[PDB]
CSV table of C-alpha atoms and ligand atoms in Angstrom, one decimal:
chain,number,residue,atom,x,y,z
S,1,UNK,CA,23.7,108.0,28.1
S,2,UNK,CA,24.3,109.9,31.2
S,3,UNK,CA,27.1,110.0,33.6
S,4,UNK,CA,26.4,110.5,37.0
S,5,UNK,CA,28.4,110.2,40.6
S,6,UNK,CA,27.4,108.4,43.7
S,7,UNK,CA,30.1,108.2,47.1
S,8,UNK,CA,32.7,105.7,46.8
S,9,UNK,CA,31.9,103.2,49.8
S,10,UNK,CA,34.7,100.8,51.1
S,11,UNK,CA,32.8,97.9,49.2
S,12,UNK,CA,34.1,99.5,45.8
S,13,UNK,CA,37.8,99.4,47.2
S,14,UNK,CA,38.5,96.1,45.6
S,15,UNK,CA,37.0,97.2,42.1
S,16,UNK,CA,39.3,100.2,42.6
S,17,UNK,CA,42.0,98.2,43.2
S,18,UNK,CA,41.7,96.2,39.9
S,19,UNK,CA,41.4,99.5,37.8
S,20,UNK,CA,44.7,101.1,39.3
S,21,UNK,CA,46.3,98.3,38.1
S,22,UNK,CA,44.8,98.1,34.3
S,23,UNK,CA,47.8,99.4,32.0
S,24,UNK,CA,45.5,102.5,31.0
S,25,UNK,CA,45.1,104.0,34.3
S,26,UNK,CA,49.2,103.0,35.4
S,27,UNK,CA,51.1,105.1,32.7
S,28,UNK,CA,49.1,108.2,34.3
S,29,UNK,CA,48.3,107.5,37.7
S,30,UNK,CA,50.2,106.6,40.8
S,31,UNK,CA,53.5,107.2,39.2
S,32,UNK,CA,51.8,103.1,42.0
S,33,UNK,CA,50.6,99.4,40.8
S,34,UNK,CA,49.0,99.9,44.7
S,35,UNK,CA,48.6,96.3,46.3
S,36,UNK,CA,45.0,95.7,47.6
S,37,UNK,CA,45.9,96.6,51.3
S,38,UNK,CA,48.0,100.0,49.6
S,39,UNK,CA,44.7,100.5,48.1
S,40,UNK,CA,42.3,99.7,51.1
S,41,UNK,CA,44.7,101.8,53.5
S,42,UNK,CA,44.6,105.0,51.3
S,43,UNK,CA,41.3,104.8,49.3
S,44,UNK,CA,39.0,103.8,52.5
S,45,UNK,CA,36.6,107.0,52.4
S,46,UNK,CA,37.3,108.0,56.2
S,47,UNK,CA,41.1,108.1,55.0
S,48,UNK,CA,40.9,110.6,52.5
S,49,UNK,CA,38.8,112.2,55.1
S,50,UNK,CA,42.0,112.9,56.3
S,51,UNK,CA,43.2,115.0,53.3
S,52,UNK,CA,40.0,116.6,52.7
S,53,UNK,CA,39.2,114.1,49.7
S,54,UNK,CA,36.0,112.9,49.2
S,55,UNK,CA,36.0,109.5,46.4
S,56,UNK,CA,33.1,108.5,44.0
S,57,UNK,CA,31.9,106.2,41.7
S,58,UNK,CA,31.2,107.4,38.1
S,59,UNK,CA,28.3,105.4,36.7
S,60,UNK,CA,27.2,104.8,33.3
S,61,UNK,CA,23.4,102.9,32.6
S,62,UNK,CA,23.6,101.4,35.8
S,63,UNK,CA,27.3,100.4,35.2
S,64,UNK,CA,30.3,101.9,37.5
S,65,UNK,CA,33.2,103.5,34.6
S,66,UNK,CA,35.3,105.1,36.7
S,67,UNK,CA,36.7,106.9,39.5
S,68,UNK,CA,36.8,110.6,40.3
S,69,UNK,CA,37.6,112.1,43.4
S,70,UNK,CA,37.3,116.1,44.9
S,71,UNK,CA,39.2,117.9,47.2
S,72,UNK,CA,39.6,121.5,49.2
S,73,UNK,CA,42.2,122.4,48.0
S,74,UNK,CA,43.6,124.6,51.4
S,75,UNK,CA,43.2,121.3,52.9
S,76,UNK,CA,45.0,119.0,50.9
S,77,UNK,CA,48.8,117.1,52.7
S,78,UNK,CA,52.2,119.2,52.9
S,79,UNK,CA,53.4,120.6,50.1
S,80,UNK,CA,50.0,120.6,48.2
S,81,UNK,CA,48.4,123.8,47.2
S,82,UNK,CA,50.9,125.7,49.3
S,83,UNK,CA,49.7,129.2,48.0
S,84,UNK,CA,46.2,128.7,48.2
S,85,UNK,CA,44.2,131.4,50.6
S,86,UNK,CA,40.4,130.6,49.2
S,87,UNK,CA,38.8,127.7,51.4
S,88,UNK,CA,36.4,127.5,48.2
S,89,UNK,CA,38.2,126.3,45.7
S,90,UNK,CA,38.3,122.5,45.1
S,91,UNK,CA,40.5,120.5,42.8
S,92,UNK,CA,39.7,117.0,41.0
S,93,UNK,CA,41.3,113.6,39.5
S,94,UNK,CA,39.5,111.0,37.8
S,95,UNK,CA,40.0,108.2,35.8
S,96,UNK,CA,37.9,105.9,33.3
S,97,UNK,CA,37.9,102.3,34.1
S,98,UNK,CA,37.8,100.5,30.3
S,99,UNK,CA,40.4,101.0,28.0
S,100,UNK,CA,37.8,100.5,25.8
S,101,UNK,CA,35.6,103.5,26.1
S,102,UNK,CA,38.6,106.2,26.4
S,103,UNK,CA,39.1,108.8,23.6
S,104,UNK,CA,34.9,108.7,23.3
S,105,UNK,CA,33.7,111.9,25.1
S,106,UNK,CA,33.0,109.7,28.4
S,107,UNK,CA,35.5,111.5,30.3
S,108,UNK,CA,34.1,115.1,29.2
S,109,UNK,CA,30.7,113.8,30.4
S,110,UNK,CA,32.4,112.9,33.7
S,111,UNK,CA,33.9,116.0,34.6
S,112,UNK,CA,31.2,118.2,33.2
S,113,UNK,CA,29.1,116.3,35.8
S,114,UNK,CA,31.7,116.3,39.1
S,115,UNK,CA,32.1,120.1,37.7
S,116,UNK,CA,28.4,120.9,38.2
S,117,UNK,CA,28.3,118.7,41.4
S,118,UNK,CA,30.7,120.3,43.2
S,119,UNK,CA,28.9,124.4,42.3
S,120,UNK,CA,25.8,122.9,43.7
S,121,UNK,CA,28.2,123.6,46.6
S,122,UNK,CA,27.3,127.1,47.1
S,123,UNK,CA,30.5,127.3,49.3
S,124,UNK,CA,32.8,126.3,46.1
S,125,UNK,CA,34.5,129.5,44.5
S,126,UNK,CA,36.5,127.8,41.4
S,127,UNK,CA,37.4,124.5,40.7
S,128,UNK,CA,40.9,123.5,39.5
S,129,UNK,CA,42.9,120.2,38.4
S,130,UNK,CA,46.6,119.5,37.7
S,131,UNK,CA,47.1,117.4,35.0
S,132,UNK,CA,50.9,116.0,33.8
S,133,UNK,CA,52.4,118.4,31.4
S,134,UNK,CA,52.6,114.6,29.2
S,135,UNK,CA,48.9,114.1,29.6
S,136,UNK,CA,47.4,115.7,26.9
S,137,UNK,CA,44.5,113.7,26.6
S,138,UNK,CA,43.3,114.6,30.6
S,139,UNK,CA,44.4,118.7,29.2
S,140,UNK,CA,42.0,118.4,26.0
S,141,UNK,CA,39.6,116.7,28.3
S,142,UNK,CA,39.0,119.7,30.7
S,143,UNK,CA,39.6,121.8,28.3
S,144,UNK,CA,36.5,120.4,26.7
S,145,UNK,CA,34.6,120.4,30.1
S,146,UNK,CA,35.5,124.6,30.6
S,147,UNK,CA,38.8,124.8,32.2
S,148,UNK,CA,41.2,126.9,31.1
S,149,UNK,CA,45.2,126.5,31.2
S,150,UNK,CA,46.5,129.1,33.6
S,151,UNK,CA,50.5,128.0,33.6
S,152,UNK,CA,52.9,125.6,35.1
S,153,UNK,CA,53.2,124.7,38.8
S,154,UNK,CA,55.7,122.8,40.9
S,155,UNK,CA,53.5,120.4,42.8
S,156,UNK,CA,54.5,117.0,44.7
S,157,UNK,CA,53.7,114.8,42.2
S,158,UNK,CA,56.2,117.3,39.7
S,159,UNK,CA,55.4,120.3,37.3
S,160,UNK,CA,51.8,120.3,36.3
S,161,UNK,CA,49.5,122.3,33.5
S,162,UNK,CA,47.0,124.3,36.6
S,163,UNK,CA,44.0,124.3,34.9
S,164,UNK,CA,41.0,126.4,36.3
S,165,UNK,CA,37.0,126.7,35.7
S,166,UNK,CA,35.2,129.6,38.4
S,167,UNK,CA,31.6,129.9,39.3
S,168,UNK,CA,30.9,133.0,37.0
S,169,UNK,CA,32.7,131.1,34.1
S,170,UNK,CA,29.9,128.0,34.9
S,171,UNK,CA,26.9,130.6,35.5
S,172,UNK,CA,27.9,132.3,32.0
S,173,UNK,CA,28.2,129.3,29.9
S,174,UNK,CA,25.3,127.4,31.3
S,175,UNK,CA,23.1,129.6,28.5
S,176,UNK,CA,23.6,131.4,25.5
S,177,UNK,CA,21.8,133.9,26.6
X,1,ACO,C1,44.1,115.8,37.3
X,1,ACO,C2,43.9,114.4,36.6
X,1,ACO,O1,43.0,113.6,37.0
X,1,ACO,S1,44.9,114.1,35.2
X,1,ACO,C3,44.6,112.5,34.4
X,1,ACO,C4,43.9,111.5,35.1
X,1,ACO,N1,43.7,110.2,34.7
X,1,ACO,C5,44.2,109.6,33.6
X,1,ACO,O2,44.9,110.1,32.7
X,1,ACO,C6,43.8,108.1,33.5
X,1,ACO,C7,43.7,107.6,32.0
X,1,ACO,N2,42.8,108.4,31.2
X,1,ACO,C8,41.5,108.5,31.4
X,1,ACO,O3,40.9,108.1,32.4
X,1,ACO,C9,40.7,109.4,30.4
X,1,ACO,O4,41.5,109.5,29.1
X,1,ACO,C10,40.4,110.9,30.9
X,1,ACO,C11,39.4,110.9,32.1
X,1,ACO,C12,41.8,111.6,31.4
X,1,ACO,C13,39.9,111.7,29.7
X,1,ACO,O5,38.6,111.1,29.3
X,1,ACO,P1,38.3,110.6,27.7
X,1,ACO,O6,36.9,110.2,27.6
X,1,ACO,O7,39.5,109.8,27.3
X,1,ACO,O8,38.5,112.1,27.0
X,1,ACO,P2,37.5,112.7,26.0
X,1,ACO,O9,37.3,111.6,24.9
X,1,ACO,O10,36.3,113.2,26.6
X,1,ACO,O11,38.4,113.9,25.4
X,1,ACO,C14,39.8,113.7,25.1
X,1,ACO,C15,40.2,114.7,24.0
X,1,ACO,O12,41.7,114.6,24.1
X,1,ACO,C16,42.1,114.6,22.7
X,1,ACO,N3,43.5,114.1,22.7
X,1,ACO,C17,44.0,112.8,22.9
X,1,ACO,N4,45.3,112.8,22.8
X,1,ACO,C18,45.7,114.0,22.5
X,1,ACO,C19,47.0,114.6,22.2
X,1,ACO,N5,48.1,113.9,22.3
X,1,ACO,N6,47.0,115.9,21.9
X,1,ACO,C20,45.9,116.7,21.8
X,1,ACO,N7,44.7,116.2,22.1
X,1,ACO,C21,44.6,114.8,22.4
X,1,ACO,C22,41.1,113.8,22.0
X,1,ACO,O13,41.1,114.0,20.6
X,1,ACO,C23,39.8,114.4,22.6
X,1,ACO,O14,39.6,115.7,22.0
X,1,ACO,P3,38.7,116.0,20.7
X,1,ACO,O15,37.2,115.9,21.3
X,1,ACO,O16,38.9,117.6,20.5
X,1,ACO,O17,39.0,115.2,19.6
X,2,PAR,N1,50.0,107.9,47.1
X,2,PAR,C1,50.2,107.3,48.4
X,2,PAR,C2,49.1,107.9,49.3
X,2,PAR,O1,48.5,109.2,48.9
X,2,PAR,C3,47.4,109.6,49.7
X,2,PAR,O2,46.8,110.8,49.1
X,2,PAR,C4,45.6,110.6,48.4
X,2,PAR,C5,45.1,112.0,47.8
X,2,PAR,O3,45.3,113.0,48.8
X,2,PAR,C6,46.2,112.1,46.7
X,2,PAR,O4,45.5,112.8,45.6
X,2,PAR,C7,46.3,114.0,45.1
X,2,PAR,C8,45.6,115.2,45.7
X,2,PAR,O5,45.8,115.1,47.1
X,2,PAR,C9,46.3,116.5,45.1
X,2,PAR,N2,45.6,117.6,45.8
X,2,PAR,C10,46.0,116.6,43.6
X,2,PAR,C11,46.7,115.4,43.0
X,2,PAR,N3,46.6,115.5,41.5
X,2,PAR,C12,46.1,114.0,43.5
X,2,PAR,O6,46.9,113.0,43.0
X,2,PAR,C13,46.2,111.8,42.6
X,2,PAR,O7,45.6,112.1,41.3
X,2,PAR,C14,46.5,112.1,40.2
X,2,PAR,C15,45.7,112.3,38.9
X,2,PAR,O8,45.3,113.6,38.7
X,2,PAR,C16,47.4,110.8,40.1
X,2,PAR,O9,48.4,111.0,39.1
X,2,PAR,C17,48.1,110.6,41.5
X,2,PAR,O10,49.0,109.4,41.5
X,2,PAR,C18,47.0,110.5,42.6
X,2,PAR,N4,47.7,110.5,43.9
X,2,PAR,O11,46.3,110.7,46.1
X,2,PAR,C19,45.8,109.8,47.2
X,2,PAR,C20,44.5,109.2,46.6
X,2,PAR,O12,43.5,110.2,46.6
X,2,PAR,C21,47.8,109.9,51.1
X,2,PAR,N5,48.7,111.1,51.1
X,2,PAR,C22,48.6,108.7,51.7
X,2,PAR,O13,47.6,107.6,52.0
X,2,PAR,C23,49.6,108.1,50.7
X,2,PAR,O14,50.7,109.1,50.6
X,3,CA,CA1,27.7,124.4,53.5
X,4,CA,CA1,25.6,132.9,28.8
């Protein structure tokens, strides 16, 4: 059915912990096998406060499937986003909880729906993600949800495919009209 988002609350910290350790979400995510307090210290919402990160909680009939998490991209730690000028651009990261339901449009659903949550922002400008050049699963994925491949960038986390979507790409696709 329908994916939607709610905040991430500090009670969903020890669910997040278990999924960041499921052999699925490892390979592409941390580098890192976080340890519940690694996990409590970093993920707490008023932390990633601290680098302009807001969590949530995808949810699937009542069920939570996954995590996804926003950020402004000017404000993001040293050595992130080091060019950026635009205060309205935000980036994004997610992950589906159940090996299980990968490869079956869920994620597409999810970041279709963090995608039109964040231009209900009329603040946001354009909305970007980073995605391993190895990950071409997350790459067809936005792809799929309306980003397009701009190039390589050196980030912390390595070289990554910076993938973009703006606001007048979202108003224009919203209709075929
Ligand atoms: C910036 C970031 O957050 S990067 C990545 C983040 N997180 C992770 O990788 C965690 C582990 N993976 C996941 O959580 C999920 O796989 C997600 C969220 C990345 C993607 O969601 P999914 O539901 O698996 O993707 P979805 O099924 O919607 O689309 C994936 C597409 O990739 C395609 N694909 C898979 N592998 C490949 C490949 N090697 N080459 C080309 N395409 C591929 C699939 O065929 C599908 O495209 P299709 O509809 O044209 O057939
Ligand atoms: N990893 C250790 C911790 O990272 C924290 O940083 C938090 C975020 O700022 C950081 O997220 C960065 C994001 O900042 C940056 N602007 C974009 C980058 N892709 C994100 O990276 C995140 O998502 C990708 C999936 O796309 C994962 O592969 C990666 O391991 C994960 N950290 O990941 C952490 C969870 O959101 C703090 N810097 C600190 O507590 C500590 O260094
Ligand atoms: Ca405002
Ligand atoms: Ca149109």
């Amino acid at each position: 059915d329908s994916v939607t988002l709610r905040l991430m609350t500090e009670h969903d910290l020890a669910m997040l912990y278990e999924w960041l350790n499921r052999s699925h979400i490892v390979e592409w995510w941390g580098g890192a096998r976080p340890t519940l307090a690694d996990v409590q210290e970093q993920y707490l919402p008023s932390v990633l406060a601290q680098e302009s990160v807001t969590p949530y909680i995808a949810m699937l009939n009542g069920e939570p499937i996954g995590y996804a998490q926003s950020y402004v991209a000017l404000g993001s730690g040293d050595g992130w986003w080091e060019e950026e000028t635009d205060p309205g651009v935000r980036g994004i990261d997610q992950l589906l909880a159940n090996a299980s339901q990968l490869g079956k449009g869920l994620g597409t659903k999810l970041v279709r729906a963090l995608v039109e949550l964040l231009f209900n922002d009329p603040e946001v400008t354009k909305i970007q993600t980073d995605p391993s050049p190895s990950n071409l699963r997350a790459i067809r994925c936005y792809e799929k949800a309306g980003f397009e491949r701009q190039g390589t960038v050196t980030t912390p986390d390595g070289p990554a495919v910076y993938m973009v979507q703006t606001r007048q790409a979202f108003e224009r696709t919203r209709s075929d009209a």
